[PDB]
Design a protein around this ligand. Structure first.
Ligand SMILES: [Mg+2]
Ligand SMILES: [Mg+2]
Ligand SMILES: [Mg+2]
Ligand SMILES: [Mg+2]
Ligand SMILES: [Mg+2]
Ligand SMILES: [Mg+2]
Ligand SMILES: [Mg+2]
Ligand SMILES: [Mg+2]
Ligand SMILES: [Mg+2]
Ligand SMILES: [Mg+2]
Ligand SMILES: [Mg+2]
Ligand SMILES: [Mg+2]
Ligand SMILES: [Mg+2]
Ligand SMILES: [Mg+2]
Ligand SMILES: [Mg+2]
Ligand SMILES: [Mg+2]
Ligand SMILES: [Mg+2]
Ligand SMILES: [Mg+2]
Ligand SMILES: [Mg+2]
Ligand SMILES: [Mg+2]
Ligand SMILES: [Mg+2]
Ligand SMILES: [Mg+2]
Ligand SMILES: [Mg+2]
Lengths: 138, 177, 119, 118, 81, 160
RNA sequence: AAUAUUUAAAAUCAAAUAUAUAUAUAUUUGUUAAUAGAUAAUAUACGGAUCUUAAUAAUAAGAAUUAUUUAAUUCCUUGGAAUAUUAUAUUUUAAAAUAUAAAUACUGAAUAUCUAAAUAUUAUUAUUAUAAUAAUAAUAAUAUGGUAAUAGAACAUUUAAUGAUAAUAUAUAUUAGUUAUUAAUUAAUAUAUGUAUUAAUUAAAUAGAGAA
RNA sequence: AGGUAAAUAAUCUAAAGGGAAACAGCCCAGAUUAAGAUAUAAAGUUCCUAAUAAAUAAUAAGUGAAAUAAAUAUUAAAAU
RNA sequence: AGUAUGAAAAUGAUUAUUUUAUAAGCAAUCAUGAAUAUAUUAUAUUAUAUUAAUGAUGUACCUUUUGUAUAAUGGGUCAGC
C-alpha cells in the first residue's frame, strides 16, 4: 500500500521565467533641509525619467517628508532595503539607486570559503559508501 | 558491454588513503579529454536516476534497456536469503479444500487458546498467516489479548515507552524513500 | 649561550636540492645574459634573430665581470662544482676550516661557489 | 566522442569554470560568484563556455573546454549583492592605535537555468 | 507487481554485511527477481534493509521517467495489493 | 549538490580486521596505518570537526614485527607525579605484563591526534595476542568473497 | 699471505667542459667506517608516536638514519626520440597482441598573478552639469606595515547666528534590518513632550577617557 | 661570557605573515580591503600535521632521526 | 543636601532557553553538528537570533624599555569628573 506525504514546491526564480527582484523604489526628499539637496537635484534633472524608461518593471514613487533623504527599495521576497542618502551629491545618489536595483532582496550574510552553489537537487552521482567504493579499504 | 569507454576511479593527485577529504587534490587531477566510465561509489536506494532503474522496470520501447548501465555486479547464487518465508524457499501450496477451511474456522471460534494459529498450521501443513486469512477468532479472545497488551504497556517504565516510540518513528522512516 | 638559535650543523636533503636548484638558476641567468649579448651583436652586424640563434660562432662577452662569470675556474657551474662547495663554505675560525652554507647569512640570495684550493 | 549515455540520462551535472574557479552544478542550482560582474546586468543570460566536465551518474565527458556544440549551459544573473559588513581590528601589542580594517566584498548570484546535451 | 508483470518471484538476499553484534550495524540486501536485482536496501537491522530494498524497487517502478523520444508510456494502473 | 542524499552509509562505522601474522609491516608502520583508519582519513566524507573513523580489530598480535634490538632495549616510561617514581619498563617486560597488543595500542595512541576524540579512537582499536576474539562475527564481509572460504569453516565461525 | 706507511685527485690515472680538433693545450670533478672515550641531582625527552624487514604469501611492507642524486629508465641536442613500467579499453586464447593515457612530483606565506572593491598620483577616455572646471564612471600603470615625528580629511558632543516643519510629529531607550557603518537611517515596541536653537553653512569649545 | 669596545651589512627597534618544537634580532617575505583558481619563497611531504615516489652506496651503533664532544684506544676498509 | 522622572551601568536573587559531571590553560575568533525561539511572502529542502557537541588558531591591556605572557609598572567593577 502507498500513501502521499503532503509537500509543497520550491520556486527557483531564474530557471523558467525570471521575475526581476526589485519591484518598487521610493525617492524621499525634503524641500527644507540642506541634507536633501543632491536628492532634490536628482529628482529635478532628467535622470529619474531615463531610469524609469530603462526599468519599466520597477515603479518609482517620489515622496516628500521633513527628515533626511531616503531611498527605500522593495523586493520580490518581501524584504525592504532603506538607504539614507543624507548630504550625497546627485551622482552618489544615482550610484546608490543602481546598487539598490542590482540587489536581490535577501539579507546580507557571511559566507564561508567556497560556499558557492546552493542546490535543492539530490546528487547526480550518489553519496559515497564504503561498501560500494571502487577501491576497498585494505 | 555496449560502450568501450576507459574507466576511471575518482582520482586525487594526493594519497587517497590518507587524504580522501582533500578537495584540492581532486581539483588538481586533470585527465585527458574524452568520454569516461566512472562507476558510482554509492548504493542505489534513494535514486530515481535512469542509470539506477532496472531493465525490467524500463519500458519496452526505452532506448536505455540496451545500454549496459544497470550493472549486475552482485550474483543471486552467491547471496544468501534474508527474512524469507517458508513459502518462497519451497513453493506455495493450494491444497486445502472448502471443507477443511470450514473445519478450521469452526475450531478457531470454539477454542483459540487450544486451537491456536500455529497448531492449525502444524495440523493442515499450511501457514499461520493463511490460517489468519481464512478464519477470525472469537472477538472476546481478541479483546482479552488487547487488554493483556495494554497491561504490558502500562507495566513499562517511561524510558521503555520512549524507546518504543523512537523504534516506531524509525520504522516509519524506513518506508519513506 | 642561554638564547637558543636552534640551527642544525648540516642541511637536510630537501635543503640541498633547493640549494642545487638555486645554483643552477644563477648559471642559467648568466647563460641568458651572454646569449642575449651575442644575439644583439649578430643583429648589429646584420643578421635576423633566428639567424643569430642558429649561428655556429657564438660571441664571447667583452665586459669584464661577464667574462669572469663565464670562466669555470672563477665561477663554476652547479654540474662542475664539488659536492663540498655546494654545501660547505670556508670558515677559518671553524674546526675543519669549514661551515655549512646554510649558516651564512642570506645564503639563499648571496652566491659563494669557489673555496680555496686546499681548504 | 560518443556522448549518448549523457544525452539519455535524466540527471546530469556540469563543472564549468569562471576565471578558472570551478563550480559543480545541476539545473536549478544557484551559484554565488565572489565578485562584481560588470559585463552582465541583472536579468542577463550567461552562456557558459569553459566547461571542464559534463557528468551523468556513471559517465563523464571531459574537455578543456568541452566542445561548445555538444552541450548547453545557460546561467541567469539573479542579483548582484554583497557579503555582510565586517570590521576586524589591526593592532600591535603595546600600541593604543587600533586600525579598523573594514570589509564588505561583492557577490553575484547566478542561477543555472538550462543544462543539457545538445 | 512482479506477479502482474512477467517477472520471477522477488527474494531478498544479503549482499554485504558489517558490524553485526554492534550498536549500529550495516546490512546491504538486494531484492532479486531471478538474477536481476530490482531494489538495493541498506539498513541497521536485516529487516530494515529488506524493507528498504522493497521500497527502492517500488520507487524505481513508479518514479520511472521515460525520455521524450520514447513513444507514450501508459501505465497499467496502481499495484492493487 | 554533491552533499545532498542519504549519508547514513558514508558515516557507517565499519569493522576492519588485520591478521598481524599475515601482515608484513613493522610495528610502527602498522600503528601509523591503523591511526588513519581510526581517525577516518581514508573516507572522503571526513571532516576534522566530526569523529567518523572505523573500528580496527587486530589479531595474532603475538607475531608482530619489531626491528633492531627494540624488543629488549626500547623502554616505556611512566610517572605518577611524586618524585622518585619514574617507572621504566622494557618492551619485552611490557609484553610479559600485558601483551604485544598493549604495545601496538600505545603506538596507535601516540599516532592519534591529541584532543577529546583521541580516547574514543583508541577504544575503537581492538587488539588480540592470539587468534580467537569476540568480534570475529562483525568484520566487513561480502557475498562474492564466500566461494573462496570452505563450507564447514564458515559454520564453525558462526557457531563461535 | 707478511712487514710498514698513507687515508691522498697536489702529482698520478679516469671522467667531463672549452680553444685548433680522431690529437694537443687549458680548466673542472673523483680518495674510509664503526665502537669506546661519554658523565648529577622534580621525570623517559629525536617536539611526541615511532623508524633498521622477512622466504612461505599476499591487487600490498621492507628507514621515517647517513652520503651523492633524480622526478619512470636510456641515448641525442629546457626539448624531442626510444625503452620498458603502471592504469585502462579492445580483440584473441588467467595469458598474449593492438592502442589511449600518465610522465608537466607535491605541500606551502597576509609573496606574485588572476578575480573583484577602496583611496592617491600619472596618462588616456566616457557621461552629467580655473567646462583648460567639478562630480561620477571606465581603462593601463605605480603606490597604500609602521613607534617617535610631520602633513591632510572627517565624524560624535555643547553653545551662538540664520531656520521650514509637527502627536500621521519629535526625542530618548531596546530589538531586528539598511548604507564600505566611531555615524546615521528603516520598522516594531516603550516612555515623554503640543514639541527640535532641528537640516544645512558658519563661528567657537570645560569638544571624545581601560590607564595619573 | 647572553661580556666589553668600536668597523661593515642585515633584521629587530617601529614589521604582522610562513619556517626554525616553543622563539624581538636566525632562514624566507613586507598586511589598502576581500576573494581563493594559478604560480610559488624559506621550510617540509609514515601518523600527530597541509604534502612523495624513486635510484646507488654506507651504517646495525636506535649511531642517528633541526642544538655534531676532544685527545687517545680497539676493530675493520681501501691505496701504496 | 532643589523638585520631578529614571528598562544607565556595576551588583544580588529568581525563572526560561541552551550547553555542561573522562576534561586542562586571556575563555575569543573562525570552522561545524544539534536544540530552542521569532518570522501576516517559511512557497522550503526557508531566514535570522540565542546556546562553551566537536575541530582548528589564539602568550590580557597599558606604561617603560635594547627587549615584557612575563614572576617589571598600574588598574576590584561600573557611573560621573
Ligand atoms: Mg596527510
Ligand atoms: Mg593593542
Ligand atoms: Mg615596543
Ligand atoms: Mg686535479
Ligand atoms: Mg633526562
Ligand atoms: Mg622533529
Ligand atoms: Mg599582495
Ligand atoms: Mg601607513
Ligand atoms: Mg573634557
Ligand atoms: Mg567613565
Ligand atoms: Mg578606548
Ligand atoms: Mg651585550
Ligand atoms: Mg623605543
Ligand atoms: Mg616578525
Ligand atoms: Mg624596515
Ligand atoms: Mg606594503
Ligand atoms: Mg638516539
Ligand atoms: Mg639533538
Ligand atoms: Mg561526558
Ligand atoms: Mg581547569
Ligand atoms: Mg601569574
Ligand atoms: Mg603584571
Ligand atoms: Mg595592582
Amino acid at each position: 500500500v502507498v500513501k502521499a506525504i503532503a509537500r509543497n514546491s520550491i520556486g527557483r526564480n531564474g530557471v523558467g521565467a525570471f521575475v526581476f527582484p526589485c519591484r518598487k523604489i521610493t525617492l524621499q526628499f525634503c524641500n527644507w533641509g540642506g541634507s536633501s539637496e543632491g536628492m532634490r537635484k536628482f529628482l529635478t534633472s532628467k535622470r529619474l525619467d531615463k531610469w524609469g524608461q530603462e526599468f519599466p518593471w520597477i515603479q518609482f514613487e517620489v515622496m516628500r517628508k521633513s527628515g533626511h533623504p531616503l531611498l527605500r527599495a522593495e523586493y520580490t521576497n518581501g524584504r525592504e532595503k532603506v538607504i539614507c542618502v543624507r548630504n550625497l551629491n546627485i551622482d552618489n545618489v544615482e550610484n546608490k539607486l543602481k546598487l539598490l536595483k542590482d540587489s536581490d532582496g535577501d539579507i546580507l550574510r557571511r559566507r564561508t570559503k567556497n560556499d558557492n552553489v546552493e542546490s535543492l537537487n539530490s546528487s547526480v552521482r550518489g553519496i559515497w559508501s564504503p561498501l560500494h567504493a571502487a577501491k576497498r579499504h585494505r | 558491454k555496449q560502450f568501450g569507454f576507459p574507466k576511471t576511479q575518482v582520482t586525487t593527485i594526493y594519497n587517497k588513503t590518507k587524504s580522501a577529504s582533500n578537495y584540492k587534490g581532486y581539483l588538481k587531477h586533470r585527465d585527458a579529454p574524452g568520454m569516461y566510465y566512472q562507476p558510482s561509489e554509492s548504493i542505489a536506494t534513494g535514486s530515481v536516476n535512469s542509470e539506477t532503474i532496472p531493465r525490467s522496470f524500463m519500458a519496452a520501447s526505452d532506448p536505455r534497456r540496451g545500454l549496459d548501465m544497470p550493472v549486475q555486479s552482485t550474483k543471486a547464487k552467491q547471496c544468501p536469503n534474508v527474512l524469507v518465508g517458508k513459502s518462497t524457499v519451497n513453493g506455495k501450496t493450494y491444497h486445502l479444500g472448502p471443507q477443511e477451511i470450514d473445519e478450521i474456522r469452526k475450531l478457531r471460534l470454539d477454542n483459540p487458546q487450544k486451537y491456536t494459529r500455529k497448531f492449525l498450521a502444524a495440523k493442515y501443513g499450511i501457514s499461520p498467516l493463511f490460517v489468519s486469512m481464512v478464519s477470525k477468532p472469537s472477538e472476546q479472545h481478541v479483546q482479552i489479548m488487547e487488554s493483556r497488551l495494554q497491561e504490558i504497556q502500562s507495566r513499562w517504565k517511561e524510558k521503555r515507552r520512549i524507546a518504543r516510540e523512537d523504534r516506531k518513528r524509525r520504522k516509519l522512516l524506513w518506508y519513506q524513500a | 649561550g642561554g638564547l637558543l638559535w636552534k640551527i642544525p650543523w648540516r642541511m637536510s636533503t630537501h635543503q640541498k636540492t633547493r640549494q642545487r636548484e638555486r645554483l643552477r638558476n644563477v648559471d642559467q641567468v648568466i647563460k641568458q645574459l651572454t646569449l642575449g649579448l651575442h644575439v644583439q651583436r649578430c643583429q648589429d652586424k646584420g643578421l635576423t634573430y633566428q639567424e643569430a640563434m642558429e649561428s655556429k660562432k657564438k660571441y664571447k662577452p667583452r665586459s669584464k665581470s661577464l667574462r669572469l662569470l663565464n670562466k669555470p675556474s672563477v665561477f663554476p657551474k652547479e654540474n662542475q662544482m664539488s659536492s663540498k662547495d655546494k654545501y660547505w663554505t670556508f670558515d677559518k675560525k671553524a674546526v675543519g676550516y669549514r661551515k655549512g652554507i646554510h649558516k651564512v647569512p642570506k645564503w639563499t640570495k648571496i652566491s659563494i661557489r669557489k673555496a680555496p684550493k686546499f681548504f | 566522442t560518443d556522448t549518448t549515455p549523457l544525452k539519455l540520462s535524466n540527471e546530469l551535472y556540469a563543472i564549468f569554470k569562471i576565471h578558472n574557479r570551478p563550480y559543480l552544478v545541476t539545473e536549478g542550482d544557484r551559484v554565488i560568484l565572489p565578485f562584481k560582474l560588470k559585463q552582465a546586468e541583472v536579468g542577463d543570460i550567461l552562456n557558459m563556455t569553459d566547461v571542464t566536465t559534463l557528468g551523468s551518474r556513471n559517465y563523464k565527458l571531459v574537455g578543456h573546454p568541452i566542445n561548445t556544440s555538444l552541450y548547453t549551459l545557460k546561467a541567469t544573473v539573479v542579483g548582484k549583492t554583497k557579503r555582510a559588513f565586517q570590521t576586524r581590528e589591526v593592532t600591535k601589542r603595546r600600541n593604543r592605535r587600533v586600525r579598523h580594517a573594514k570589509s564588505k566584498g561583492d557577490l553575484t548570484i547566478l542561477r543555472i537555468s538550462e543544462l543539457s546535451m545538445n | 507487481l512482479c506477479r502482474r508483470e512477467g517477472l520471477e518471484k522477488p527474494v531478498s538476499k544479503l549482499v554485504a554485511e558489517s558490524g553485526r553484534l554492534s550498536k549500529s550495524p550495516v546490512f546491504i540486501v538486494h531484492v532479486f527477481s531471478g538474477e536481476e536485482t530490482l531494489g538495493e536496501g541498506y539498513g541497521s537491522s536485516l529487516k530494515e534493509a529488506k524493507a528498504r530494498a522493497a521500497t527502492d524497487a517500488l520507487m524505481k517502478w513508479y518514479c520511472y521517467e521515460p525520455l521524450a523520444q520514447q513513444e507514450p508510456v501508459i501505465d497499467p494502473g496502481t499495484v492493487v495489493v | 549538490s554533491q552533499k545532498i542524499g542519504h549519508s547514513g552509509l558514508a558515516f557507517a562505522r565499519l569493522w576492519h580486521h588485520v591478521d598481524v601474522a599475515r601482515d608484513k609491516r613493522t610495528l610502527g608502520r602498522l600503528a601509523s596505518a591503523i591511526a588513519i583508519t581510526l581517525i577516518g582519513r581514508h573516507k572522503p566524507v571526513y571532516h576534522p570537526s566530526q569523529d567518523c573513523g572505523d573500528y580496527v580489530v587486530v589479531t595474532n598480535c603475538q607475531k608482530i614485527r619489531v626491528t633492531g634490538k627494540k624488543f629488549e632495549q626500547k623502554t616505556y616510561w611512566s610517572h605518577s607525579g611524586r618524585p622518585g617514581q619514574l617507572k621504566l619498563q622494557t618492551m619485552n617486560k611490557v609484553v610479559a605484563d600485558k601483551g604485544f597488543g598493549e604495545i601496538l595500542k600505545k603506538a596507535v595512541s601516540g599516532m592519534l591526534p591529541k584532543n577529546k576524540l583521541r580516547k574514543q579512537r583508541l577504544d575503537r582499536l581492538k587488539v588480540f595476542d592470539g587468534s580467537e576474539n569476540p568480534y570475529k562475527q562483525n568484520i566487513t564481509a561480502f557475498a562474492h568473497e564466500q566461494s573462496s572460504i570452505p563450507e564447514p569453516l564458515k559454520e564453525s565461525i558462526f557457531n563461535q
